[PDB]
Amino acid sequence: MYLSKVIIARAWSRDLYQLHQGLWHLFPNDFLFHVEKRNTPEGCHVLLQSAQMPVSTAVATVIKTKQVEFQLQVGVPLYFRLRANPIKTILDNQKRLDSKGNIKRCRVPLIKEAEQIAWLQRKLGNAARVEDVHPISERPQYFSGDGKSGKIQTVCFEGVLTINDAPALIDLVQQGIGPAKSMGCGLLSLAPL
C-alpha cells in the first residue's frame, strides 16, 4: 500500500463530509485517512493510506508519497496509533418507544476506558497483543455548525503491541479497524521501536 502526506485547502475541508470527498478525487486512474492537523492557514493535514498512488488536485495537494512493503515477524514489538470510533448499542434510558411500539435501541460511544481497551483488544484478536495502551478520548467532530448537529466521537489509541500473526495484522492494516472509515477513523499506523 501507499502512505502519503496530503494537505486539503481550508475552504474545501471545513465540513467532515468534505474531507472524504476531497480525498476521493485524488484517484483519477477504498482508502483510509488520519487527520494530523485539523485547522491551519493552508488547510487540513492528513495522512492517507491507499492502494493506488494519489494524484494531486487543485484543492488536495499530495506533499509526499511512500510505498510500504511489510516485513513482519512474530514476536516483534511495534508502536501503534489508531483513531477509532468505538461504539455499542443500548436500550434508550428513558424507555422511549419507536413507531412500532418498541423501546429504541441507541448507538452510543464507549466512554469508559476499560471498555475502550477491551474493544481494541477484541478488534486486534489473534493478530497481536496489546503490550501497553493509552486511550485518548478526543473532542467530537460535528457534521455541521447547527446547534442540533450530530457528531462522531473518537478515541485515539496509542501504545505498543507485539505481533502474533503477521498475515492477520497485515489484513487489519489493509482493511482498517472499526466504524466511520470514511470520516478519518480506522487507519492503524505501525512503527518499529
PDB file of C-alpha atoms in Angstrom:
ATOM      1  CA  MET A   1       0.000   0.000   0.000  1.00  0.00           C
ATOM      2  CA  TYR A   2       0.966   3.674  -0.105  1.00  0.00           C
ATOM      3  CA  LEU A   3       1.257   6.229   2.663  1.00  0.00           C
ATOM      4  CA  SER A   4       1.024   9.883   1.698  1.00  0.00           C
ATOM      5  CA  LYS A   5       1.004  13.245   3.402  1.00  0.00           C
ATOM      6  CA  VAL A   6      -1.812  15.347   1.932  1.00  0.00           C
ATOM      7  CA  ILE A   7      -2.959  18.900   2.597  1.00  0.00           C
ATOM      8  CA  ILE A   8      -6.547  19.888   1.857  1.00  0.00           C
ATOM      9  CA  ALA A   9      -7.325  23.581   1.273  1.00  0.00           C
ATOM     10  CA  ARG A  10      -9.228  25.229   4.125  1.00  0.00           C
ATOM     11  CA  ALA A  11     -12.251  26.234   2.047  1.00  0.00           C
ATOM     12  CA  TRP A  12     -12.559  22.603   0.990  1.00  0.00           C
ATOM     13  CA  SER A  13     -12.029  20.924   4.344  1.00  0.00           C
ATOM     14  CA  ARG A  14     -14.436  22.830   6.580  1.00  0.00           C
ATOM     15  CA  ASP A  15     -17.013  20.043   6.964  1.00  0.00           C
ATOM     16  CA  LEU A  16     -16.338  16.411   7.872  1.00  0.00           C
ATOM     17  CA  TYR A  17     -18.296  15.364   4.775  1.00  0.00           C
ATOM     18  CA  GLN A  18     -15.927  17.384   2.559  1.00  0.00           C
ATOM     19  CA  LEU A  19     -12.719  15.682   3.680  1.00  0.00           C
ATOM     20  CA  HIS A  20     -13.534  12.246   2.255  1.00  0.00           C
ATOM     21  CA  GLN A  21     -14.887  13.903  -0.918  1.00  0.00           C
ATOM     22  CA  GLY A  22     -11.717  15.899  -1.494  1.00  0.00           C
ATOM     23  CA  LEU A  23      -9.557  12.845  -0.850  1.00  0.00           C
ATOM     24  CA  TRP A  24     -11.649  10.642  -3.151  1.00  0.00           C
ATOM     25  CA  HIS A  25     -10.772  12.940  -6.078  1.00  0.00           C
ATOM     26  CA  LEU A  26      -7.083  12.021  -5.650  1.00  0.00           C
ATOM     27  CA  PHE A  27      -7.703   8.778  -7.515  1.00  0.00           C
ATOM     28  CA  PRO A  28      -8.492   9.661 -11.156  1.00  0.00           C
ATOM     29  CA  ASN A  29      -6.991   6.493 -12.696  1.00  0.00           C
ATOM     30  CA  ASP A  30     -11.135   2.460  -0.936  1.00  0.00           C
ATOM     31  CA  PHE A  31      -8.594   4.408   1.123  1.00  0.00           C
ATOM     32  CA  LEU A  32      -8.121   5.278   4.812  1.00  0.00           C
ATOM     33  CA  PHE A  33      -7.065   8.568   6.429  1.00  0.00           C
ATOM     34  CA  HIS A  34      -5.969  10.129   9.711  1.00  0.00           C
ATOM     35  CA  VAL A  35      -6.261  13.856  10.289  1.00  0.00           C
ATOM     36  CA  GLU A  36      -2.922  15.124  11.623  1.00  0.00           C
ATOM     37  CA  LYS A  37      -3.718  18.853  11.766  1.00  0.00           C
ATOM     38  CA  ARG A  38      -7.326  19.955  11.502  1.00  0.00           C
ATOM     39  CA  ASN A  39      -7.060  23.747  11.081  1.00  0.00           C
ATOM     40  CA  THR A  40      -4.046  25.564   9.652  1.00  0.00           C
ATOM     41  CA  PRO A  41      -3.845  28.529   7.248  1.00  0.00           C
ATOM     42  CA  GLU A  42      -3.217  26.124   4.359  1.00  0.00           C
ATOM     43  CA  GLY A  43      -5.976  23.763   5.491  1.00  0.00           C
ATOM     44  CA  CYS A  44      -6.215  20.220   6.851  1.00  0.00           C
ATOM     45  CA  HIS A  45      -3.105  17.988   7.086  1.00  0.00           C
ATOM     46  CA  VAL A  46      -3.912  14.324   6.548  1.00  0.00           C
ATOM     47  CA  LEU A  47      -2.077  11.006   6.483  1.00  0.00           C
ATOM     48  CA  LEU A  48      -3.553   8.935   3.645  1.00  0.00           C
ATOM     49  CA  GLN A  49      -3.285   5.172   3.169  1.00  0.00           C
ATOM     50  CA  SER A  50      -4.285   3.891  -0.250  1.00  0.00           C
ATOM     51  CA  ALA A  51      -3.862   1.037  -2.713  1.00  0.00           C
ATOM     52  CA  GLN A  52      -3.003   3.498  -5.517  1.00  0.00           C
ATOM     53  CA  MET A  53      -0.687   6.497  -5.580  1.00  0.00           C
ATOM     54  CA  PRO A  54      -2.744   9.659  -5.126  1.00  0.00           C
ATOM     55  CA  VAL A  55      -2.739  12.388  -7.790  1.00  0.00           C
ATOM     56  CA  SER A  56      -2.945  15.992  -6.586  1.00  0.00           C
ATOM     57  CA  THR A  57      -5.965  18.172  -7.397  1.00  0.00           C
ATOM     58  CA  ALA A  58      -6.442  21.938  -7.162  1.00  0.00           C
ATOM     59  CA  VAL A  59      -7.646  21.616  -3.563  1.00  0.00           C
ATOM     60  CA  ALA A  60      -5.839  18.480  -2.318  1.00  0.00           C
ATOM     61  CA  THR A  61      -2.063  18.631  -2.564  1.00  0.00           C
ATOM     62  CA  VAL A  62      -0.045  15.430  -2.212  1.00  0.00           C
ATOM     63  CA  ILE A  63       3.078  16.595  -0.366  1.00  0.00           C
ATOM     64  CA  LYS A  64       4.831  13.219  -0.459  1.00  0.00           C
ATOM     65  CA  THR A  65       4.112   9.531  -1.044  1.00  0.00           C
ATOM     66  CA  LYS A  66       5.973   6.456   0.250  1.00  0.00           C
ATOM     67  CA  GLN A  67       5.230   2.841  -0.656  1.00  0.00           C
ATOM     68  CA  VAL A  68       5.219   0.292   2.140  1.00  0.00           C
ATOM     69  CA  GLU A  69       6.326  -3.298   1.734  1.00  0.00           C
ATOM     70  CA  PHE A  70       5.828  -5.136   5.013  1.00  0.00           C
ATOM     71  CA  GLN A  71       8.473  -7.164   6.851  1.00  0.00           C
ATOM     72  CA  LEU A  72       6.799  -8.587   9.956  1.00  0.00           C
ATOM     73  CA  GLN A  73       7.876 -11.458  12.181  1.00  0.00           C
ATOM     74  CA  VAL A  74       6.065 -12.963  15.147  1.00  0.00           C
ATOM     75  CA  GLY A  75       7.242 -11.525  18.474  1.00  0.00           C
ATOM     76  CA  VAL A  76       8.205  -8.143  17.032  1.00  0.00           C
ATOM     77  CA  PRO A  77       7.114  -5.145  19.148  1.00  0.00           C
ATOM     78  CA  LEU A  78       5.682  -2.103  17.310  1.00  0.00           C
ATOM     79  CA  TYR A  79       4.348   1.306  18.201  1.00  0.00           C
ATOM     80  CA  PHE A  80       0.743   1.665  17.059  1.00  0.00           C
ATOM     81  CA  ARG A  81      -1.673   4.542  16.616  1.00  0.00           C
ATOM     82  CA  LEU A  82      -5.362   4.154  15.795  1.00  0.00           C
ATOM     83  CA  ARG A  83      -8.064   6.806  15.784  1.00  0.00           C
ATOM     84  CA  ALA A  84     -11.249   4.786  16.156  1.00  0.00           C
ATOM     85  CA  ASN A  85     -14.979   5.173  16.670  1.00  0.00           C
ATOM     86  CA  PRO A  86     -15.751   2.596  19.351  1.00  0.00           C
ATOM     87  CA  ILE A  87     -19.486   2.269  19.919  1.00  0.00           C
ATOM     88  CA  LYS A  88     -22.090  -0.052  21.374  1.00  0.00           C
ATOM     89  CA  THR A  89     -25.873  -0.400  21.309  1.00  0.00           C
ATOM     90  CA  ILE A  90     -28.046   0.163  24.392  1.00  0.00           C
ATOM     91  CA  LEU A  91     -31.764   0.452  25.178  1.00  0.00           C
ATOM     92  CA  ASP A  92     -32.903   4.062  25.446  1.00  0.00           C
ATOM     93  CA  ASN A  93     -32.570   5.069  29.111  1.00  0.00           C
ATOM     94  CA  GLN A  94     -35.957   6.817  29.166  1.00  0.00           C
ATOM     95  CA  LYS A  95     -37.503   3.754  27.505  1.00  0.00           C
ATOM     96  CA  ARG A  96     -38.785   5.936  24.652  1.00  0.00           C
ATOM     97  CA  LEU A  97     -40.742   3.991  22.015  1.00  0.00           C
ATOM     98  CA  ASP A  98     -40.355   3.967  18.234  1.00  0.00           C
ATOM     99  CA  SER A  99     -43.217   3.998  15.703  1.00  0.00           C
ATOM    100  CA  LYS A 100     -43.820   0.241  16.135  1.00  0.00           C
ATOM    101  CA  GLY A 101     -44.221   0.410  19.920  1.00  0.00           C
ATOM    102  CA  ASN A 102     -40.702  -0.874  20.661  1.00  0.00           C
ATOM    103  CA  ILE A 103     -38.129   0.609  23.034  1.00  0.00           C
ATOM    104  CA  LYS A 104     -35.500   2.369  20.916  1.00  0.00           C
ATOM    105  CA  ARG A 105     -32.055   0.776  20.587  1.00  0.00           C
ATOM    106  CA  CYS A 106     -29.471   3.588  20.579  1.00  0.00           C
ATOM    107  CA  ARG A 107     -25.891   3.699  19.302  1.00  0.00           C
ATOM    108  CA  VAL A 108     -23.578   5.236  21.881  1.00  0.00           C
ATOM    109  CA  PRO A 109     -19.793   5.829  22.112  1.00  0.00           C
ATOM    110  CA  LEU A 110     -17.624   3.813  24.508  1.00  0.00           C
ATOM    111  CA  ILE A 111     -16.624   6.335  27.154  1.00  0.00           C
ATOM    112  CA  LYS A 112     -15.230   4.022  29.847  1.00  0.00           C
ATOM    113  CA  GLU A 113     -11.502   3.384  29.395  1.00  0.00           C
ATOM    114  CA  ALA A 114     -11.755  -0.267  30.445  1.00  0.00           C
ATOM    115  CA  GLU A 115     -14.354  -0.754  27.691  1.00  0.00           C
ATOM    116  CA  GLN A 116     -12.272   1.115  25.102  1.00  0.00           C
ATOM    117  CA  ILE A 117      -9.247  -1.111  25.797  1.00  0.00           C
ATOM    118  CA  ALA A 118     -11.433  -4.221  25.658  1.00  0.00           C
ATOM    119  CA  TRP A 119     -12.746  -3.031  22.253  1.00  0.00           C
ATOM    120  CA  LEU A 120      -9.205  -2.591  20.924  1.00  0.00           C
ATOM    121  CA  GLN A 121      -8.001  -5.979  22.190  1.00  0.00           C
ATOM    122  CA  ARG A 122     -11.117  -7.532  20.656  1.00  0.00           C
ATOM    123  CA  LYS A 123     -10.505  -5.953  17.212  1.00  0.00           C
ATOM    124  CA  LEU A 124      -6.844  -6.969  17.218  1.00  0.00           C
ATOM    125  CA  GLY A 125      -7.752 -10.526  18.184  1.00  0.00           C
ATOM    126  CA  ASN A 126      -5.179 -13.148  17.219  1.00  0.00           C
ATOM    127  CA  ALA A 127      -3.163 -10.626  15.167  1.00  0.00           C
ATOM    128  CA  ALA A 128      -1.362  -9.001  18.090  1.00  0.00           C
ATOM    129  CA  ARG A 129      -1.158  -8.487  21.841  1.00  0.00           C
ATOM    130  CA  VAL A 130      -1.602  -5.013  23.278  1.00  0.00           C
ATOM    131  CA  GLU A 131       1.513  -4.549  25.456  1.00  0.00           C
ATOM    132  CA  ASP A 132       0.662  -1.035  26.552  1.00  0.00           C
ATOM    133  CA  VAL A 133      -2.064   1.422  25.540  1.00  0.00           C
ATOM    134  CA  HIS A 134      -3.281   4.932  26.298  1.00  0.00           C
ATOM    135  CA  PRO A 135      -6.790   5.633  25.009  1.00  0.00           C
ATOM    136  CA  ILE A 136      -7.074   9.353  24.443  1.00  0.00           C
ATOM    137  CA  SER A 137     -10.724  10.445  24.311  1.00  0.00           C
ATOM    138  CA  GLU A 138     -10.746  13.190  21.673  1.00  0.00           C
ATOM    139  CA  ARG A 139     -13.120  16.091  21.175  1.00  0.00           C
ATOM    140  CA  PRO A 140     -16.065  15.109  18.982  1.00  0.00           C
ATOM    141  CA  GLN A 141     -16.395  16.141  15.349  1.00  0.00           C
ATOM    142  CA  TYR A 142     -19.700  17.643  14.292  1.00  0.00           C
ATOM    143  CA  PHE A 143     -21.420  17.237  10.921  1.00  0.00           C
ATOM    144  CA  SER A 144     -22.316  20.948  10.833  1.00  0.00           C
ATOM    145  CA  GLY A 145     -22.383  24.208  12.797  1.00  0.00           C
ATOM    146  CA  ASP A 146     -26.061  23.755  13.572  1.00  0.00           C
ATOM    147  CA  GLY A 147     -26.821  23.763  17.298  1.00  0.00           C
ATOM    148  CA  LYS A 148     -28.542  20.390  16.949  1.00  0.00           C
ATOM    149  CA  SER A 149     -25.839  18.767  14.820  1.00  0.00           C
ATOM    150  CA  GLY A 150     -24.880  15.184  15.488  1.00  0.00           C
ATOM    151  CA  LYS A 151     -21.234  14.212  15.851  1.00  0.00           C
ATOM    152  CA  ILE A 152     -18.705  11.406  15.654  1.00  0.00           C
ATOM    153  CA  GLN A 153     -16.916  10.640  18.924  1.00  0.00           C
ATOM    154  CA  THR A 154     -13.450   9.123  18.580  1.00  0.00           C
ATOM    155  CA  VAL A 155     -10.721   7.685  20.776  1.00  0.00           C
ATOM    156  CA  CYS A 156      -7.105   7.751  19.701  1.00  0.00           C
ATOM    157  CA  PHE A 157      -5.369   4.585  20.887  1.00  0.00           C
ATOM    158  CA  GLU A 158      -1.583   4.854  21.164  1.00  0.00           C
ATOM    159  CA  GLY A 159       0.929   2.385  22.554  1.00  0.00           C
ATOM    160  CA  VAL A 160       2.915  -0.735  21.823  1.00  0.00           C
ATOM    161  CA  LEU A 161       1.814  -4.107  20.539  1.00  0.00           C
ATOM    162  CA  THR A 162       3.563  -7.390  19.819  1.00  0.00           C
ATOM    163  CA  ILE A 163       2.893  -9.240  16.587  1.00  0.00           C
ATOM    164  CA  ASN A 164       1.281 -12.684  16.989  1.00  0.00           C
ATOM    165  CA  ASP A 165       0.209 -13.433  13.399  1.00  0.00           C
ATOM    166  CA  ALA A 166       1.784 -11.425  10.572  1.00  0.00           C
ATOM    167  CA  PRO A 167      -0.817 -12.090   7.832  1.00  0.00           C
ATOM    168  CA  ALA A 168      -3.669 -11.287  10.233  1.00  0.00           C
ATOM    169  CA  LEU A 169      -2.055  -7.983  11.252  1.00  0.00           C
ATOM    170  CA  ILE A 170      -1.417  -7.044   7.621  1.00  0.00           C
ATOM    171  CA  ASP A 171      -5.087  -7.656   6.889  1.00  0.00           C
ATOM    172  CA  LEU A 172      -6.106  -5.324   9.727  1.00  0.00           C
ATOM    173  CA  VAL A 173      -3.837  -2.583   8.405  1.00  0.00           C
ATOM    174  CA  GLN A 174      -5.144  -3.010   4.851  1.00  0.00           C
ATOM    175  CA  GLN A 175      -8.829  -3.110   5.844  1.00  0.00           C
ATOM    176  CA  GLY A 176      -8.800  -0.601   8.684  1.00  0.00           C
ATOM    177  CA  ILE A 177     -10.462  -1.111  12.069  1.00  0.00           C
ATOM    178  CA  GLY A 178     -13.918  -0.180  13.309  1.00  0.00           C
ATOM    179  CA  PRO A 179     -16.666   2.174  12.086  1.00  0.00           C
ATOM    180  CA  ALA A 180     -16.506   5.514  10.292  1.00  0.00           C
ATOM    181  CA  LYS A 181     -13.604   4.717   7.976  1.00  0.00           C
ATOM    182  CA  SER A 182     -14.854   7.406   5.569  1.00  0.00           C
ATOM    183  CA  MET A 183     -14.677  10.003   8.401  1.00  0.00           C
ATOM    184  CA  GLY A 184     -10.997   9.604   9.304  1.00  0.00           C
ATOM    185  CA  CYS A 185     -11.165   6.583  11.622  1.00  0.00           C
ATOM    186  CA  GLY A 186      -9.732   3.116  11.306  1.00  0.00           C
ATOM    187  CA  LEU A 187      -6.221   3.746   9.969  1.00  0.00           C
ATOM    188  CA  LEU A 188      -3.845   1.596  12.002  1.00  0.00           C
ATOM    189  CA  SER A 189      -0.359   3.135  11.836  1.00  0.00           C
ATOM    190  CA  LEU A 190       2.589   0.935  12.836  1.00  0.00           C
ATOM    191  CA  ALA A 191       6.266   1.710  13.506  1.00  0.00           C
ATOM    192  CA  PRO A 192       9.355  -0.162  14.777  1.00  0.00           C
ATOM    193  CA  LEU A 193      10.666   0.667  18.250  1.00  0.00           C
TER     194      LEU A 193
END
